[PDB]
């Protein structure tokens, strides 16, 4: 399968500068005009630059010409894109493409986070029963930034009736919950535990839902 | 560059409705002399990254479902499904590549299902969180439809709408139902002055409340 990683994104100050990459594979990518897509937290898609296959042409859009230059690197199969006095409006999710009808696919996203704020990993708490046929499990991944945090229930073996809420902003600081239900026989016989990860902070963390006290 | 134009923002029908959507280009995608029309139809799941579904404007990629379909040509052009299942929820944003390119601000497709009560679960603070200054008390309300409710907390007998704070979570791809977590953050101290705490769901799904509290640490 074709293959399209972009990294080196994540927070960074305004007015600050940062250098995404695409790693390509799967495809004779030097063959190929990519391109780098962006999404606003808002959910708007919005094309930020292309270079044609050789590299011998880049095209922008009016207004990203100037803060972005996309340049590629057929002998490294790697697409690069600089972004430079980086404001806030500039956070979004940034996605490597590739718009060719017989390679048509886009990876999975770097998050980049425009704010003065600063990285503090996340806090993850338990959610135990309290004081049935189903068992209903929580996780509290709280006072995180910035985005995102990955959660997964017993190393993801319990896809499913699980459910992750998105985080609520407050004090520039991400707090969000994950719920996960299995039937009563299971839990606490056998165990069940969320496996939080945050990547701004490289922080991999997991915790067993244990049956509270008493 | 050429702005491209996407209505209604929102769309909402029930498994197996035929549904189109408008995509509008500031000027012809058209070349004269093929009639092709340089448009696009990218389709983008809840956490997933777009996928094209068509292109030039009526042409599915390979391994897209045949409900799928599109029209229009010159500036104007339409996405339809002719029957709209529980996995087709996604925006679908149309694009154009005439010019550069441009994106659309895309529609959301919702599925209407059959009303749905929620399953509520109240969680008191882990003793881990306490043990910093905090108490977050959870509330789960899972599963559920529509997705207007109602969540109020009553600690003690009185209401609190201070410390807490709503997550709706999008549509689900399978049963098509909501989830939404109520969660009341008050301090480590602020949280043992009192020992009832109660999370009050009434959802149009029944008259009666769903009420799931508990007592501090009673166990």
Partial sequence: ???????????????????????????????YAMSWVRQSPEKRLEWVAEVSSDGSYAYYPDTLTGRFTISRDNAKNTLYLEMTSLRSEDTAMYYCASFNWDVAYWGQG?????????????????????????????????????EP???????????????????????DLYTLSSSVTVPSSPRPSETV?????????????????????? | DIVMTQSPSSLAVSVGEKVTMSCRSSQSLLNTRTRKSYLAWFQQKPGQSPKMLIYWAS????????????????????LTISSVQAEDLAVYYCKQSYSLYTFGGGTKLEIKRADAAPTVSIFPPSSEQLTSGGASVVCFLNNFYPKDINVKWKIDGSERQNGVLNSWTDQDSKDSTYSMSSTLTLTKDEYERHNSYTCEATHKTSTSPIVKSFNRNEC
């Fill in chain 1, 110 to 146: 770097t998050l980049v986070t425009v704010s003065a704020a600063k990285t503090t990993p996340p806090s993850v708490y338990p959610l135990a029963p309290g004081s049935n046929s189903m068992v209903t499990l929580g996780c509290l991944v709280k006072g995180y930034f910035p």
């Fill in chain 2, 59 to 78: 042409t599915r990629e390979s391994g897209v479902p045949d409900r799928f379909t599109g029209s229009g040509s010159g500036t104007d052009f339409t």
């Fill in chain 1, 1 to 31: 399968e074709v293959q399209l990683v972009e990294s080196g994104g994540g927070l960074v100050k305004p007015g600050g500068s940062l250098k995404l990459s695409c790693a390509a594979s799967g495809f004779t990518f030097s063959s």
């Fill in chain 1, 193 to 214: 535990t969320c496996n939080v990860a945050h990547p701004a902070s490289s922080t991999k963390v997991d915790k067993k839902i244990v049956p509270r006290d008493c």
């Fill in chain 1, 149 to 171: 945090v990955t959660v997964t229930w017993n190393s993801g073996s319990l896809s499913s009736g699980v459910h992750t809420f998105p985080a609520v902003l407050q004090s």
